[PDB]
Amino acid sequence: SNLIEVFVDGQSVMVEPGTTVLQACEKVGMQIPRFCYHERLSVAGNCRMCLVEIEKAPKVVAACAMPVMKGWNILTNSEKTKKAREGVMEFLLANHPLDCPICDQGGECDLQDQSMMFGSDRSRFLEGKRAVEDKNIGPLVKTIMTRCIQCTRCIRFASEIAGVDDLGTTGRGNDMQVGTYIEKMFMSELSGNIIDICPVGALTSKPYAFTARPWETRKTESIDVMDAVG
Amino acid sequence: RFIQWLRNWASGRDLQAKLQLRYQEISKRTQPPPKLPVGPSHKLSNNYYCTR
Ligand code: SF4
Ligand code: SF4
């Protein structure tokens, strides 16, 4: 009742009528690459990394924002999907500078755990690499806005849960930027909690800045006691 | 010389295959700077993933 069997790689599963292709393929234990998407946020689509070749169609669709019709064959690995996940993640790895000796998210960036598995082998660009300038906002958010692959993820968070309407999009085409037009500081509750959301190492912590790389720590779970909600 | 042929009566006569390469006709040095060819489908427009 209230379901459609969709053959994800030729294998049945029953979802709600009106869910997403992403949640369907993640239900059967698979990962499609995720840049312009978050579960705890709204949904946009302006990275165009999830691209699956749907069966009985010459075109390619993106799994972020579309419903699922009567049961398709969501052909995950094809000889054309790998001509797309290689495709998009060759452009955005060009207009970007050669950091990571010094990029402080250097052990967990999503241009670094996608780029071994998916994507191409070498480069053919071979000169270019625009370089914008940075600024300061508060004494907590160490700020390199050069890297900033414009996935529109920090931007919606101002309209999301933290209701401070502060950020925007300034520019057109190749040249757009993310930071505040005026030099207004941005600080309230949750204001230091953006540096987890930024999926590359363009945003990071100010006191933590130059200490140690994230493959030497020992992750032990615990609880903080500085408030009554735990 | 007379100490020479006593080495040539004993255990045959070699005179050229010395146990040292310390003399001449050991390769001393090599001049040119090297450059390596980059061959096996390193190029573009056909060399392309999901084929390899
Ligand atoms: S901080 Fe950088 S990675 Fe995060 S949403 Fe903004 S542009 Fe994208
Ligand atoms: S954030 Fe990603 S692209 Fe930037 S230096 Fe780290 S791994 Fe490289």
Ligand code: FES
């Ligand atoms: S993954 Fe967000 S749009 Fe493809």
